[PDB]
Amino acid sequence: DVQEQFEGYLREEVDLLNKFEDSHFKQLEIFYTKSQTDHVINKDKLQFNALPFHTTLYKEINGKRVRLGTLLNWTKAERLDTIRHESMIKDERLRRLIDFDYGWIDYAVVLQRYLDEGNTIESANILQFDGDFVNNIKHPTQKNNFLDIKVIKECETYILMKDDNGIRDPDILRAWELNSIPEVIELDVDGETKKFNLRKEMIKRIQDEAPVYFFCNPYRYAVANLDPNIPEVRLWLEYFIGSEDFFGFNGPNVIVSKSLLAAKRFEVVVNHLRKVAAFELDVESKEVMNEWIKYIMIDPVYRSYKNRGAFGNLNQHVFARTKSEGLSWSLIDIGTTNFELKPTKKVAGSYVNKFNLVDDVLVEESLKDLRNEGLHKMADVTRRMIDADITPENVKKGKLNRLALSYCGYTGSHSATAMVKQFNDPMFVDIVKDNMRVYMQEGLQKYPQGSRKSNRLDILFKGSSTNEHAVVNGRFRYRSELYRERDVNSSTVFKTATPGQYRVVKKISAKLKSKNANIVTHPMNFINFKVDDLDIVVNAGSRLVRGTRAKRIITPNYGTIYAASLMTVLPAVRLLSSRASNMGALSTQGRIALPHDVMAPQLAVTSSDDVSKICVAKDFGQFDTSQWGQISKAHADGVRSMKAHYSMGHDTLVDLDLNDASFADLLEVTAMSYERPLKYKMNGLVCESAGVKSGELTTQTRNTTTNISHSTVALDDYNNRAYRLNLPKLELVTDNKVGDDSVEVLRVVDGSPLTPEIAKLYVNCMQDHADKNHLEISAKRTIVGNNVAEHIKIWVFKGYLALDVFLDSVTSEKNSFSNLNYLEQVNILYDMAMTLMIRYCSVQACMTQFCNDMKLLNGIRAGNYTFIPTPKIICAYGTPEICLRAPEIRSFGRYLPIDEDEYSVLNDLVASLSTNKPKMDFVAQMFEQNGNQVHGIWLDHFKRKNDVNPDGGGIHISEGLKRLMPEYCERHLNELVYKTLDDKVIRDYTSDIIITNICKGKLSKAPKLAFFANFYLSLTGFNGVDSPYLTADEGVKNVHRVIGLSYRNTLSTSPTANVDRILRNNPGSAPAYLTGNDILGVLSDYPYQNWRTVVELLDITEPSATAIIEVATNQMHAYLADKDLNTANLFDNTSRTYDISDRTYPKFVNITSNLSNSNRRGFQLEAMKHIIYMARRGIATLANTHPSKIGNTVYYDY
Amino acid sequence: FALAQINADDEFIGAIDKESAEYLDEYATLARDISNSLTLVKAAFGPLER
């Protein structure tokens, strides 16, 4: 009777979908007035005017009508004064809010109801300017030797540096009243310099330090969620309307009125509301969050920066002494790549034997600091959680401190100050040199194509910060039947012959700054290298991070150095990244996604009766200063050591041609780039780096080599000390070393239990060889234990996992959310919700958050009209087809019992919501206005070599084949350049096309579905093992218990990535411009019988051709399934955690028909969808391709 | 080619018993009707002639 239950659950899914859509429409009925007309898409005829302010667009099909969406005509804005208008606003406080920016009008009138409820808020004190800051401004110049700091050269900006008469942490922006000194005298070398402190601190700091970029319109969100009766909303209002603290948004930027960091309070309060709603925190957690929101409302960001250190020190030791037994896993096969988590019985009472270093003095010091700040309850709950038991509530209470830190959002220090802080043993250098040499040798052995001169151009094409770029200038014109007569002005929109049709032109002039466009347009910069290029400056980039971590600075290498690195160092990085099965743990690839698999050895060690095994975690900070000097030269010498294997070479650096230079010269230039200081500039500040330099594609290798050397010397030193004074020795079992974060498991040789003496001796590191400060900092950084460990924001405790919390979608860097199309925004919201569900969020909370996020989306805006499509587009094809109760399973909406006509019309709607015509038109006009942009070297290099008739066998050459065929390459290449350029006008044109096509009744015909089959289920047994994700939702843990957990060895690989690997491993076999996506598409167009002929027309040599054919033959199902959906923004972590591979197919899918491999795998995934949906509820089922009882008399088997 | 395996359930046997009773009754009624018709045709109609 499982089939009947499945059908009933699908019917409940349909009911929930209808309720959700109805609720969305009802909620949108309050932001804009009740819908005035029901406009039929095809039956009715309208001339785009006389349509009311709010209209419901319906479509009629087979005697039935479906609800497409809502249209808003902004010309008839009079209706909006029915709900919001200045006439109703009466209270004197909100008049200024109205005058500052009209966008608050709605919220304003809402607030008035609260005011008409009789309750009045009180003004709040705003903290004043602290004068000592005036002593913290430093203006460096050549007279003072740039304040005797080596990195700073040619600086024309102020720096906030610590001073005796200055406030602590000067760089961090503080919330201040704007009535602070307009003009303050500066005591420079001359002493007459004057600085407009108010102007700079109000303009530059409000945007560089504290950006606020809401995913939706902040006014709409405030109206929808910020209910005045909530205590937190009242408290923020006291800071908002009380004391008259006003702020608003113009374009992308934020404008303040009286107080700095006004918008940060809004960000903090909305973060509080959403986080509290999502986490389903208990009453005690609500109390501590009330305390924190009270404590940090004074300064939204700085208080967090105060308590970073205490919070980190307290969170490191969470659950250090836990009496609870927890989970258990086997340590069998721990030193190989094939390790998996398997259950194993453990005898009770192992808790007393386990031990984790606590460093109690620091813990009490952090506690005292917390009391001094006034966070008494949080300190108490953290102290309790240090020694408490294991429970989801307990672990949420433990991570509640990081939840509190996540309040600020995107906050960073001063840009120039951040630059100056970040920029500024023979055995060790020998070890690091040896490690770099062995890595280089292995990399050059695995991928030796870089050395050969012929492959250099192909590698350069496949693989910035170049000084010179080309510019494209022109005017993009298109016909719009969407504007009004009033808007017609001689600059942009022109009244044409047609009474209702206008011609809108947009003047563009932009530089093709992307790496690929610059590579095709200007390759001489990348190819030719002069010595002076080691001295030129390149622009740097700045990336703020969520939380209060240090701002990241990105320093790209120059084009010539980049080409050299691609030729020489890239093989080592590629070999390091590749780890495969049947390899030892302590191997070059083994030493260096899915949290459970990557942290599996630690997860097994922390839950084990064996006490010899210990987990040691090391985090290295501010090692760039250590990276300066000797070890940089050691890396350079390690790179130079490979020049003995290549004959032609020069004694010193000379100007070279990339495709003619011997490999020795390229190796020498890479060594010089490694060891010489490099100059970088941003915001008028120039600095030099002699350390890691943060050069892309090279940081990981250098950092992990340094960490490996550190671990080796530390272990050897501990062994020597253990010999000197009798103590059991240690032996490294496995290790993981990513960036500067390392975690290794060490086993005591004699099997004696771990002792605090052992941990203390290992922590002491270089004793009697270095100063005591090194010992102290080593004690503070690392941890050693048997109960709790951490690595890349993954917290493991007694066989249980915990993820991080600094992740949301309301506020994003660079506001890119507001730029993407509707479907991309929906995909981004869906993906963030999915990655949330795997950690701390249940389906109820995450789905409520997702629905509220959907309800506030901006909608397609074009001209003076706006389209809000139906929310039922989620289940439609093209969007992730999801059932609400089981959101993880993508593309499951097809099987739901939606009406066939309704589903068809929804599919056409979502298909029409995205079009590719505007980009083609833009590229065509750019080509017609600016002409050819590709260099002649790429013109002559990409020529037909396989000596095959272009006509083929007389077969039909489709459009894609003609695009990718060599004789028509040049035009195609130009398109790539013009596909690089992105500008507003393409998406405004797309919105206009969508509006016109929708209203006129033209719906794009949806593409057919590749795979679809109804699978009939029967009962069966369990296969999986219980989920280490304790905090995750019940459904995911049930799925883990029924099916199992996945692993990187068993994880499936996308066909496009496989084709890319095949193309890259054999340079010169296929043209460099060809990508896996294009070849896969053109193969999917043609029948497979002619596929070989196709690869002959694409000029693909045999080693690549046969492999590509095999991949297409075995893996076309993956491409056909995701053909119509852009999965660039989909990282389904929860879906990836499930074990859907060949290991679980026989136990859950029964297919008896004879089918090809691609079709078989596609139908196996189709069955797996049903299996996962059923298993979410703890019922294990087996899918079959035939019903068990077709007739009341007949019963079927097999 | 696709011969099915005949399965005898309890409900089928019960239905068969009910039909067995029905057939017995109908056979008896047919016999009585035939006897009555024979008596009538012997008592009423005599020989026919050219």
Binding site: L1155, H1186, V1194 | -
Partner: protein
């Protein structure tokens, strides 16, 4: 309730299943149109192929 019965009877009214129908259709689709005129003169048409395989 009649729709479910009709869908179920579809399984028994023919020896094919949607998986096999898709597999068979993956062979003859676009095959005839792609080849050249001379080869088209010596290969069955798409309708002919569907008639033979179904």
């Amino acid at each position: 309730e009649k729709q479910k019965l009709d869908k179920l009877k579809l399984f028994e009214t023919s020896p094919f299943d949607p998986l096999t129908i898709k597999n068979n259709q993956d062979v003859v689709d676009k095959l005839y149109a792609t080849q050249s005129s001379s080869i088209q003169e010596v290969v069955p048409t798409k309708t002919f192929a569907t008639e033979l395989q179904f």
